[PDB]
Each structure stands twice: as structure tokens, then as C-alpha cells.
Amino acid sequence: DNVFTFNISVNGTEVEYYAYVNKTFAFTYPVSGFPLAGSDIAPAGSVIG
Amino acid sequence: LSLSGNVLYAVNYPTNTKSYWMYFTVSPSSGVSSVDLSPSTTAISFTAASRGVSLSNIYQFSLLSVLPSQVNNKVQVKLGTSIINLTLAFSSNSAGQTYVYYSDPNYALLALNYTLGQEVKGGQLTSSPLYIISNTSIVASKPWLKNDNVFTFNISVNGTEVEYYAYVNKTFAFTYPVSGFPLAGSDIAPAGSVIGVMILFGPGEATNVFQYETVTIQITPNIGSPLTISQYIYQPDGKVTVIG
Amino acid sequence: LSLSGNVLYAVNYPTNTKSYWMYFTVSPSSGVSSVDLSPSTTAISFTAASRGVSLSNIYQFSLLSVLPSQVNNKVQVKLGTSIINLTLAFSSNSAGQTYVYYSDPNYALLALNYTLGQEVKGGQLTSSPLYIISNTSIVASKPWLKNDNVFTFNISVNGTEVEYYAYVNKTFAFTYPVSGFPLAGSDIAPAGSVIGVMILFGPGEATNVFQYETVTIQITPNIGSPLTISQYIYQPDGKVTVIG
Amino acid sequence: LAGLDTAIILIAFIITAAVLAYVAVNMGLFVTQKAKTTINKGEETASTA
Amino acid sequence: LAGLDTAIILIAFIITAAVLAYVAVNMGLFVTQKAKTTINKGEETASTA
Amino acid sequence: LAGLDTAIILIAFIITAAVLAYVAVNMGLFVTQKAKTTINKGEETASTA
Amino acid sequence: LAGLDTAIILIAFIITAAVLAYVAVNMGLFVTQKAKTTINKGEETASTA
Ligand SMILES: *[C@@H]1O[C@H](CO)[C@@H](O[C@@H]2O[C@H](CO[C@H]3O[C@H](CO)[C@@H](O)[C@H](O)[C@@H]3O)[C@@H](O)[C@H](O)[C@H]2NC(C)=O)[C@H](O)[C@H]1NC(C)=O
Ligand SMILES: *[C@@H]1O[C@H](CO)[C@@H](O[C@@H]2O[C@H](CO[C@H]3O[C@H](CO)[C@@H](O)[C@H](O)[C@@H]3O)[C@@H](O)[C@H](O)[C@H]2NC(C)=O)[C@H](O)[C@H]1NC(C)=O
Ligand SMILES: *[C@@H]1O[C@H](CO)[C@@H](O[C@@H]2O[C@H](CO[C@H]3O[C@H](CO)[C@@H](O)[C@H](O)[C@@H]3O)[C@@H](O)[C@H](O)[C@H]2NC(C)=O)[C@H](O)[C@H]1NC(C)=O
Ligand SMILES: *[C@@H]1O[C@H](CO)[C@@H](O[C@@H]2O[C@H](CO[C@H]3O[C@H](CO)[C@@H](O)[C@H](O)[C@@H]3O)[C@@H](O)[C@H](O)[C@H]2NC(C)=O)[C@H](O)[C@H]1NC(C)=O
Ligand SMILES: *[C@@H]1O[C@H](CO)[C@@H](O[C@@H]2O[C@H](CO[C@H]3O[C@H](CO)[C@@H](O)[C@H](O)[C@@H]3O)[C@@H](O)[C@H](O)[C@H]2NC(C)=O)[C@H](O)[C@H]1NC(C)=O
Ligand SMILES: *[C@@H]1O[C@H](CO)[C@@H](O[C@@H]2O[C@H](CO[C@H]3O[C@H](CO)[C@@H](O)[C@H](O)[C@@H]3O)[C@@H](O)[C@H](O)[C@H]2NC(C)=O)[C@H](O)[C@H]1NC(C)=O
Ligand SMILES: *[C@@H]1O[C@H](CO)[C@@H](O[C@@H]2O[C@H](CO[C@H]3O[C@H](CO)[C@@H](O)[C@H](O)[C@@H]3O)[C@@H](O)[C@H](O)[C@H]2NC(C)=O)[C@H](O)[C@H]1NC(C)=O
Ligand SMILES: *[C@@H]1O[C@H](CO)[C@@H](O[C@@H]2O[C@H](CO[C@H]3O[C@H](CO)[C@@H](O)[C@H](O)[C@@H]3O)[C@@H](O)[C@H](O)[C@H]2NC(C)=O)[C@H](O)[C@H]1NC(C)=O
Ligand SMILES: *[C@@H]1O[C@H](CO)[C@@H](O[C@@H]2O[C@H](CO[C@H]3O[C@H](CO)[C@@H](O)[C@H](O)[C@@H]3O)[C@@H](O)[C@H](O)[C@H]2NC(C)=O)[C@H](O)[C@H]1NC(C)=O
Ligand SMILES: *[C@@H]1O[C@H](CO)[C@@H](O[C@@H]2O[C@H](CO[C@H]3O[C@H](CO)[C@@H](O)[C@H](O)[C@@H]3O)[C@@H](O)[C@H](O)[C@H]2NC(C)=O)[C@H](O)[C@H]1NC(C)=O
Ligand SMILES: *[C@@H]1O[C@H](CO)[C@@H](O[C@@H]2O[C@H](CO[C@H]3O[C@H](CO)[C@@H](O)[C@H](O)[C@@H]3O)[C@@H](O)[C@H](O)[C@H]2NC(C)=O)[C@H](O)[C@H]1NC(C)=O
Ligand SMILES: *[C@@H]1O[C@H](CO)[C@@H](O[C@@H]2O[C@H](CO[C@H]3O[C@H](CO)[C@@H](O)[C@H](O)[C@@H]3O)[C@@H](O)[C@H](O)[C@H]2NC(C)=O)[C@H](O)[C@H]1NC(C)=O
Ligand SMILES: *[C@@H]1O[C@H](CO)[C@@H](O[C@@H]2O[C@H](CO[C@H]3O[C@H](CO)[C@@H](O)[C@H](O)[C@@H]3O)[C@@H](O)[C@H](O)[C@H]2NC(C)=O)[C@H](O)[C@H]1NC(C)=O
Numbered sequence A: 001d002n003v004f005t006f007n008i009s010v011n012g013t014e015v016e017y018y019a020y021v022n023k024t025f026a027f028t029y030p031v032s033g034f035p036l037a038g039s040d041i042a043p044a045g046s047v048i049g
Numbered sequence B, C: 001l002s003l004s005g006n007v008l009y010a011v012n013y014p015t016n017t018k019s020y021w022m023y024f025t026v027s028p029s030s031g032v033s034s035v036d037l038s039p040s041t042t043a044i045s046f047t048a049a050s051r052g053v054s055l056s057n058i059y060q061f062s063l064l065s066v067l068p069s070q071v072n073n074k075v076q077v078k079l080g081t082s083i084i085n086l087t088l089a090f091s092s093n094s095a096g097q098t099y100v101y102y103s104d105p106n107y108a109l110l111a112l113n114y115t116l117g118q119e120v121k122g123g124q125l126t127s128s129p130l131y132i133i134s135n136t137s138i139v140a141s142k143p144w145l146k147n148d149n150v151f152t153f154n155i156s157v158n159g160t161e162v163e164y165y166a167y168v169n170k171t172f173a174f175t176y177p178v179s180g181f182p183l184a185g186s187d188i189a190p191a192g193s194v195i196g197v198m199i200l201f202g203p204g205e206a207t208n209v210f211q212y213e214t215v216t217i218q219i220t221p222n223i224g225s226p227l228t229i230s231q232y233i234y235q236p237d238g239k240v241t242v243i244g
Numbered sequence D, E, F, G: 001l002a003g004l005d006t007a008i009i010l011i012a013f014i015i016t017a018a019v020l021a022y023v024a025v026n027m028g029l030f031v032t033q034k035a036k037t038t039i040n041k042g043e044e045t046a047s048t049a
Helices: B105-121 B137-141 C105-121 C137-141 D002-047 E002-047 F002-047 G002-047
Strands: A002-010 A013-021 A030-032 B008-011 B019-027 B043-048 B053-055 B059-062 B076-079 B082-085 B089-094 B097-102 B130-133 B149-157 B160-168 B172-179 B194-200 B213-220 B227-233 B240-242 C008-011 C019-027 C043-048 C053-055 C059-062 C076-079 C082-085 C089-094 C097-102 C130-133 C149-157 C160-168 C172-179 C194-200 C213-220 C227-233 C240-242
Touching: B019 B149, B019 B213, B043 B194, B059 B105, B076 B160, B097 B105, B105 B130, B105 B149, B105 B160, B105 B172, B105 B194, B172 C043, B227 D002, C019 C149, C019 C213, C043 C194, C059 C105, C076 C160, C097 C105, C105 C130, C105 C149, C105 C160, C105 C172, C105 C194, C227 F002, D002 E002, D002 F002, D002 G002, F002 G002
Parallel strands: B059 B172, B097 B172, C059 C172, C097 C172
Antiparallel strands: A002 A013, B008 B019, B008 B240, B019 B194, B043 B053, B043 B213, B076 B082, B089 B097, B130 B160, B149 B160, B172 B194, B213 B227, C008 C019, C008 C240, C019 C194, C043 C053, C043 C213, C076 C082, C089 C097, C130 C160, C149 C160, C172 C194, C213 C227
């Protein structure tokens, strides 16, 4: 299956993560203006990744 | 009824922790016929559905019932030695009718404080939900005023700013005439009149400001279609904000 | 109604501590039909939402009701020995109709001072909110004029500048004809007329100048859509400033 | 009789039309205010930057 | 007799008209509410994007 | 009857259209003045330096 | 009799509908001409400067 990598920093140390992806899929997540956590509703003036 | 002005919303700006009042103006639609607005027959509902607030009827009082002689020269300011009688209901004549109106919500609030205090004094009402004072020193002697909702407004008297503190026991609405109202005493809005509607929040609904939320108000008179008003409210941007 | 001129705003320039008046011009939209502007039926609201100022109806008077013979030769200037009668309402004829107008807000203000003083004298009005004098020596004998809002304007009489001091008790609006108005006596603006609207600030709203603020005015006649006027006001740049 | 029963159908049909009148006026007041709000937000979206 | 039998046809025709009144008012209340709901969904469809 | 009830739907629909007329004219007067103000501020922004 | 009285309600209801017809046609002729005039004044307002 498909694999890509990304780094995050933890205790100022780079940690590489390997992400394995079984099939093409999409997901959404809140970026700003989202108080409705739990709902799946994007309110007016929210920003969704 | 048609909404015939902007909807104004007031909060403890800039802190935005607490909600004070909403004001808006209504008039009979397209000038066709008169509307009974008596608070016994009519309901005004208020819902902020997101936060589960739903009030089926908040409408309690109207200054449409009130003649100018019942409110003018009946509240007064002590500026040092001098005592000044306020005029609150303004009036003008056309075709032998006296038109009556309140120039702003502040004079309407003072006229209501007087009217409701006078109805309590007359035993017609158990308690006024509104109490208005200039002197805050009084509050220590009246501990029920400590916990209910409070907002302030200024009027000018002898060119001097007088701050009044309005204490609100529960969320309620009242109506008052703004123009085209000759029918003082009646509670009827005639065609081509303009009526101010004001909602004052109590300590329940006041608890935090409306943001990222839909507020719905509905006025339902005893005859004819109700007027349903809805705004999605963004963060309020001033002491008063235009929400709709 | 359409806004059919710029919106002019006057302040105590350059000091900008105090606010005097707003002036603007309106006319029936697209020449289609006439508008009733009687101050009994119509409301003019004024809101500066940022500072929590909200007046539901400031409209009190109209010179549309007033015939030229009621104001011309009825105010006068004593220039030494000589006494000069002022002409304030100008007039012209077309198709057997007499058109009536005021050439500037200054002659409109003087015509209003006369009209309201005459209505007080006739017992039709309790007090005029406007009082206009050339002699300031009078003010010491009339202490209520000490604290209310004051602005000045000059007119020329016998080629001599005469300064008038206008004392304003409360924020109010009036209307007067500017062109295309043959219906003197009526309060009706016919299609293709032009009407001046002027707001004079009282000591409340005058207290500091509008800056970095939105001001909204709404004219709501008894039939038809209201005219809503809104300006964000930057710092005012002259004795009069164009805000919109 | 021809009128008595005919008077029952008139009363009922008046009430039926009045119910549509009630709903249509209310919902027109609602939607026109949604339009007012939308027009405002459209201008704000074009002006704010 | 002319009235007795005539009184039987009046009672019956009243009931018959009252049954239409009952149905027409109920179904008007129904359809006008379907209209209310539809008008709301039409505005939501125009506003949401 | 056919007209009486039909006259109820005409009155109501007139009022409903008049309410849109009222809102659309008011909001056109509003937005066109926002445009006037914006055009002025755009020129001032291009001229002032 | 069943028809004689029934013939009284037909005559009257015809007249009643004809009265609505009379009013609706007259007032349609009126309002459509107000529209014609308005459309003309709208063009004149856009062209004259
Ligand atoms: C993301 O994290 C990686 C491990 O957490 C890290 O790789 C480690 O770094 C060095 C080798 O140098 C690398 O540097 C360049 C630029 O970062 C890379 O593009 C290049 O391919 C080299 O791998 C080594 O000590 C260590 O073993 C590496 N670990 C692994 C697992 O590769 C990456 O440097 C870091 N950043 C990027 C951009 O990939
Ligand atoms: C301004 O407000 C005052 C308080 O509401 C009011 O006083 C009340 O007056 C009424 C009867 O009015 C007469 O007496 C008053 C003096 O009290 C005179 O000012 C007035 O001209 C009349 O002669 C009286 O029943 C009531 O008890 C008074 N209330 C109080 C608290 O004193 C004034 O009348 C009113 N107007 C003026 C001009 O001051
Ligand atoms: C709103 O109504 C209150 C009654 O519900 C009223 O309180 C009463 O006040 C009176 C005295 O009123 C005079 O004096 C005050 C200052 O003390 C002035 O502001 C006012 O204009 C009057 O001239 C008092 O006798 C009584 O005990 C009070 N009653 C209660 C229940 O406290 C308020 O005065 C009134 N608000 C205003 C602004 O008038
Ligand atoms: C809201 O409800 C409270 C409880 O029902 C009530 O408190 C009581 O007040 C009375 C009288 O004091 C006030 O009377 C008027 C109302 O007619 C007030 O506007 C004004 O502030 C007076 O001070 C008092 O005797 C009693 O002990 C209180 N009881 C309790 C349980 O609180 C409030 O009066 C009422 N209104 C307001 C404005 O708070
Ligand atoms: C508001 O209420 C106060 C108490 O409820 C009251 O003060 C009491 O009054 C006297 C003292 O005279 C005061 O008078 C002037 C004008 O009102 C005040 O500005 C000045 O500071 C004095 O305090 C006294 O018997 C009593 O102890 C005072 N009580 C308290 C707690 O101060 C005020 O007079 C009254 N009005 C104003 C405008 O503050
Ligand atoms: C409304 O009236 C208030 C009292 O009648 C007045 O407050 C008095 O003014 C000064 C303090 O300056 C104030 O000024 C700014 C702007 O007005 C306020 O936002 C700020 O919070 C200050 O309080 C002081 O001499 C006096 O003690 C104040 N009195 C009280 C009771 O606060 C307000 O200035 C006036 N206007 C507004 C907008 O609130
Ligand atoms: C200029 O203004 C004067 C003041 O308004 C006005 O005087 C008033 O005149 C009316 C009647 O007019 C007659 O009398 C005046 C002299 O008073 C003559 O000028 C005029 O030709 C007429 O003969 C009178 O009722 C009123 O009391 C007068 N008011 C005052 C304060 O004197 C003048 O009439 C007017 N025109 C001229 C030409 O001076
Ligand atoms: C406008 O002011 C002029 C002075 O600036 C003045 O001219 C002078 O007038 C005096 C007195 O004579 C006039 O008296 C009346 C005015 O009401 C006239 O109708 C009459 O014709 C007289 O001429 C004169 O001594 C002097 O010579 C004049 N000055 C000059 C330079 O000629 C005007 O009279 C005055 N006009 C009005 C209408 O008040
Ligand atoms: C605006 O209206 C005032 C009345 O509300 C009026 O005050 C009155 O003035 C009259 C006398 O008027 C004459 O004299 C003055 C100079 O003293 C001239 O400017 C004016 O043109 C007239 O020829 C006086 O009898 C009365 O007592 C005053 N009334 C009040 C309530 O003070 C003003 O004169 C008027 N303004 C103007 C410019 O005319
Ligand atoms: C604004 O309101 C004041 C109080 O309501 C009022 O003060 C009173 O004035 C009267 C009469 O004097 C004036 O009359 C006219 C108004 O008709 C004024 O334009 C002009 O300046 C006159 O001098 C006086 O008898 C009374 O004592 C005053 N009372 C108080 C409590 O102030 C003002 O007249 C009124 N208008 C203006 C322009 O200030
Ligand atoms: C404005 O009002 C003044 C007083 O209210 C008045 O002055 C009074 O009038 C006389 C003195 O004559 C004056 O006349 C001329 C022309 O008006 C003035 O320029 C000159 O300086 C004189 O003062 C006197 O009886 C009274 O004591 C005066 N009072 C005061 C306080 O001076 C003015 O005449 C009047 N008009 C003008 C134009 O100032
Ligand atoms: C509004 O406040 C003024 C002060 O800001 C005040 O003027 C001062 O008044 C005092 C006392 O005199 C007046 O008393 C009554 C007021 O009820 C008046 O009717 C009467 O005519 C007196 O003049 C005075 O010592 C002082 O000189 C005045 N100050 C100035 C600068 O002239 C007003 O009296 C007051 N007005 C009202 C109606 O309360
Ligand atoms: C408006 O009329 C005023 C009096 O009718 C006049 O003021 C008189 O003029 C001089 C003083 O010069 C003034 O000139 C500039 C520009 O006009 C003013 O801004 C400045 O403040 C001066 O006051 C003097 O002889 C006379 O005493 C003044 N009288 C008064 C009462 O001030 C103004 O010049 C005139 N124009 C303007 C724009 O205000």
C-alpha cells in the first residue's frame, strides 16, 4: 500500500512518521472558527481543512 | 407586521461576557390594516436554539396603553439643589389628533420604570421586573438587585450626563410608540404607525453573549400572521451592534 | 426616498471636542410617486452603534408646512439705527404654481426659529428645542441656555456679516424644501422635489465628535420603504466635512 | 337546504384560504429578512479585506 | 310529511358538507405546512454553499 | 364562494409581494450608498500620498 | 323546490364571482399601467444625466 512520511518536533527533536494508506480517502478537520466540536457542522465563519 | 428598522443588540462591550438588550422597530405591513399589540393577547417568543434557550412568551408591557400625562413630569433628577422634571413622551398634532412617541429607548425605559412602579404601588402588578436608579448606593440595602442582570445608560439633563442603572429580574419584552401613533391608551398599532420593540435580558439569558448562533424572535398577535425575525449573530462589535 | 446630495457634518473645528449638525438632501426615488414627510407620521432614527447612541425618532418639525408669508419679513436685523426685514423662503412661478425653497440651511434655521417661537407663543408647542439669537448678552439672563448645545452661523445683511448663535435643547431633525416643491402647506414631497433634512445635535449626542465610527440614519415614512443612510466617519477635516 | 349546506362549504373554504394567507405572509416576512441579512453579508464580504 | 322527509335530506346534506369542510380544512393545514417547509428548504438550498 | 376565498389569497399575496418590494428597495438604497462611499474611499486611496 | 331555492344560490353566486371579475380586471389594468409608467421613469432615470 501507499506510503509517505512527515516530521514533527518533540522535545526539540525531529520525529519522522511513516503513514501507510490502504485506499484513496478524504477527511476533514477544523482549522479556525469551529466551536461546534462533536457535530460535523461547519458554522458560518469557520475554516475547515 | 413588518420589521421596519435594523435589529440592535447591546452587550458589556468590549468584554462580551454579558448580554443586555435587543431593540427593533415594527409597523403594520404595506399600510393595509391595524394590529392589536396588547401584551395580554399577543405573544413574543425568543429562541437561541444552539444553546437550548426557548421562551414561549416574554411580552409583558406596552407604553401604547400610556398617556403622556401619566409619565411626563413624574420622574425627576436632583442636580445638587435643583430638581428637574423629565419629559419622556413627546407629542405633536395633526388633523386634531395628538400623536405620541418616545424619542429613544432610554426615555422609553424611564417611562416604563415609572409605569410599572406605579402599577406595583396601585396593587395591579405583584413586582416590576425592571428597576431603574441613578444612585448605586441604594443597592447594598436591596440584596435582590445584587444578582439580577444590570446595564447602564446615560441621558442629558441641564446639559449634564446622568447615568441610570437598569436592574432586570427576568427576560421580558415591551413595546412603545415611535411614530404615527395617535391611539394613545389603546395598545393598537394603526396602519402607518411605527412601534419600538425592546427585549431586556434577565440573569438567565444574559449569562454569556450570542456568538456563532442563530437567534429567532416571533411576534404573534391575536389576528393575522406572526412576524418571525431571525439573525445569525457574529461576535458583537460595539456597545450596540447591528445584527439584522 | 433616495439620498440626492452629499451628507455634510459640522463640528467645532479644529478643536473637534463637540458636534453641531448633519445636513443631507433627499428626493422621491426615480420620480415615480410622492412621499408623505409629516413629522407626526414619519420617523427619523439616528444610531452611532459604537458609542451606544440610539435614538428611535428625532424628527420633530417641517418647513414644508410653512407658507413664505409666515416667515418672510417676520425676523429682522437692527444694524445701528436701520432695521432690515429678512427674506428666508425664496419663491418662483411655473405653470401657475408657486414653488418654495430655502437657499441654505441658515435661512432654514432662522425660518424654523421663528416658526417654533410662534408655535410656543400660540400655545401649540410647550417649548422650542431651538433658540437663535445674535445678541449673546441675553444668555446671562437665561441660564438654561448655558448648558445646552450651541453652534454659530453667519448671514450677510446690508453687506454686513451678522453672526447668529443657535442653542439646541435636544437632538432633533427637521425638513425643508430645496427645489421642485409647489405643495407649500402639505408636508408632502412630490415626485421631482428635493428636500433638505437637517439634524441638530443636543448636549447629549454633541458631547464628543464622531471618529472611527459608523453613523446610521433612517427615514421611515408611513407608506413605502424607509431610506437607510450609513457612513463610517473618519476624523472631520473642516468646519463642515463631507462624510458620505 | 341548498344554501345551508352551501354555507358550510363557504365557511370552511374561507378558513382554508385564510390558513394559506397566514402561512404565505409569515414565510414571505421570514425569507425577505433572510434576503436582507444575506445582502448585508454579501456587501461585508466584498468590502472587508 | 312534506317537511318531515325534507328534514331528513337537510340533516344528511349538512353532515355531507361538514365532512367536506373537515377534509378540506385538514388538508389545507397539511399542504400549507408542506409549503412552509419547502420554502425554508429552498432558502437553505440558496444560502448554504 | 369561488371568489370570496380566492379574494383572501389575492389580498395576502399582494401584502407578501409588497413586503419583498419594501425590503428590496430599502436594501438597494443601502447597498448603493455603501458603493458610493466605497468609490469615494477608493479614489481617496489612489489620490492621497 | 330543491331546484327553485338552489337556483337562487346560483344567481347570487354568479353575481358575486362577476363582481370579483370586474374588480380584478379593473385593478389589473390599473397596476399594469402603473408598472408601464414606472418602467418608463426607471429608463429615464438611467438615461438622463
Ligand atoms: C526528518 O526526520 C528524519 C528522521 O527523523 C531525518 O533524517 C535523519 O537525518 C540524518 C540524515 O540526514 C537527512 O537529511 C536530509 C534533510 O533533512 C534528508 O533529506 C536526507 O534524506 C537525510 O536522511 C540521519 O542522522 C538520520 O539517520 C535520518 N533518519 C532517517 C530515518 O532518515 C530528516 O533529516 C528530517 N527532515 C527531512 C526534511 O526529511
Ligand atoms: C414635577 O415632578 C414632581 C414630582 O413628580 C411633581 O411634584 C408632585 O406634584 C403633585 C401635584 O402638583 C402640584 O404640586 C407640585 C409640587 O409638589 C407643583 O410642582 C405643581 O406645580 C402642582 O402645584 C403632587 O400631588 C405630588 O405629591 C408631587 N410629588 C412630589 C414628589 O413632590 C411636580 O408637580 C412636577 N412639576 C413641576 C412643575 O415641578
Ligand atoms: C422606578 O420605579 C421605582 C419603583 O418601582 C422607583 O423607586 C422608588 O423611588 C421613590 C422616590 O422617587 C423619587 O426619588 C428618586 C431618587 O430617590 C428619583 O430618581 C425619582 O425620579 C423620584 O423623584 C421612593 O419613594 C420609593 O421607595 C422607591 N420604590 C422602590 C420600590 O424602591 C424609582 O425611583 C423609579 N426610577 C426613577 C428613575 O424614577
Ligand atoms: C424580582 O423578583 C424578586 C423576588 O420575586 C423581588 O425581590 C423582592 O423585592 C421586594 C420589594 O423590593 C423591590 O420592589 C420592586 C418590585 O416591585 C423592585 O423593583 C425594587 O428593587 C424594590 O426594592 C422585597 O420586599 C422582597 O424582600 C424581595 N424578595 C426576594 C425574594 O428577592 C424583586 O423586587 C423583583 N424585581 C426586581 C427589579 O428585582
Ligand atoms: C445617594 O444615596 C446615598 C446613600 O443612600 C446618599 O448619601 C447619604 O446622604 C447624606 C450625606 O450627603 C450626601 O449628599 C451629597 C449629594 O447627594 C453627596 O454627593 C455627598 O457625597 C454626601 O454623601 C448622609 O446622611 C448619608 O450618610 C449618606 N449615605 C452614604 C452611604 O453616603 C446620597 O446623597 C445620594 N445621592 C447621591 C447623588 O450620591
Ligand atoms: C455616562 O455617565 C457617567 C456618569 O454619569 C460618566 O462617567 C463619569 O465620567 C468620569 C470618568 O470618565 C468616564 O469616561 C469614559 C467615557 O465616557 C467612560 O467610558 C469611563 O468608564 C469613565 O468612567 C468621572 O468623572 C465620573 O466619576 C464618571 N461617573 C461614573 C458613575 O462612572 C460617563 O463618562 C458617561 N459616558 C459613558 C459613555 O459612559
Ligand atoms: C418687517 O418686519 C416687521 C417685524 O416683523 C414688521 O412689523 C410688523 O408689522 C405688522 C403689520 O405691518 C404693518 O405695520 C408695519 C410696522 O409695524 C409696517 O412696516 C407695514 O408696512 C404694515 O403697515 C404689525 O402687526 C406688527 O406689530 C409689526 N411688528 C413689529 C415688531 O413692529 C414689518 O411690517 C415688516 N415689513 C416692513 C416693510 O417693515
Ligand atoms: C445700509 O447701510 C449703509 C451704511 O453702510 C446705509 O447707507 C448710509 O445711510 C445713511 C442714512 O441714510 C439712509 O437711511 C435709509 C436706510 O434705512 C435709506 O433708505 C435712505 O435712503 C438713506 O440713504 C446715510 O447717511 C449714508 O450716506 C449712507 N452711506 C452711504 C455710503 O451712502 C444704508 O442706508 C443702509 N441700508 C438700509 C436699507 O438699511
Ligand atoms: C427665535 O425665536 C425666539 C422665540 O422662541 C425669539 O425670541 C424672542 O424675541 C422677541 C423679539 O424679537 C425681535 O427682536 C430680536 C432682537 O431682540 C430680533 O433678533 C428679532 O428678529 C425680532 O425683531 C422678544 O420679544 C421675545 O421675548 C423673545 N422670546 C423669547 C422666548 O426669548 C427670537 O428673536 C427668534 N430669533 C430671531 C433671530 O428672530
Ligand atoms: C429646553 O427645555 C428647557 C426645560 O424644559 C427650557 O427651559 C425653560 O425655558 C423657559 C422659557 O424660556 C425659553 O423659552 C423658549 C422655549 O419655548 C426658549 O427657546 C428660550 O431660550 C426662552 O428663554 C423658562 O421659563 C424656564 O424657567 C426654563 N426651565 C428650565 C427647567 O430650564 C428651555 O426653554 C427649552 N429650550 C431651549 C431652547 O433651551
Ligand atoms: C444686546 O443686549 C445688550 C444687553 O442685553 C444691549 O446693551 C444694553 O443697551 C443699553 C446700552 O446701549 C448699547 O447699545 C449699542 C447697540 O446695541 C451697543 O453696541 C452699546 O455697546 C451699548 O451697550 C443699556 O441700557 C444696557 O445697560 C446695555 N446692557 C449691556 C449689558 O450692555 C445691547 O444694546 C444689545 N445689542 C447689541 C448690538 O449689542
Ligand atoms: C442648571 O444648572 C446651572 C449650573 O450649571 C444653573 O445655573 C446656575 O444657577 C444658580 C442658581 O440660580 C438659578 O436657580 C434656578 C434653577 O432652578 C433658576 O430658575 C434661577 O433663574 C437661578 O438662575 C446661579 O447661582 C448661577 O449663576 C447659574 N449659573 C450660571 C453659569 O448662570 C441653572 O439654574 C440650572 N437650571 C435649572 C433649571 O435647574
Ligand atoms: C462671522 O461673523 C462674526 C461676527 O459677526 C465675525 O467675527 C468678527 O470679526 C472680527 C474678528 O475676526 C474674526 O475673523 C476670523 C475669520 O472670520 C474668525 O475666525 C476669528 O475667530 C475672528 O473672530 C471682529 O472685529 C469682531 O469682533 C468679530 N465678532 C465676533 C462676534 O466674533 C467673523 O469673522 C465672521 N466669520 C467667521 C468665518 O466666523
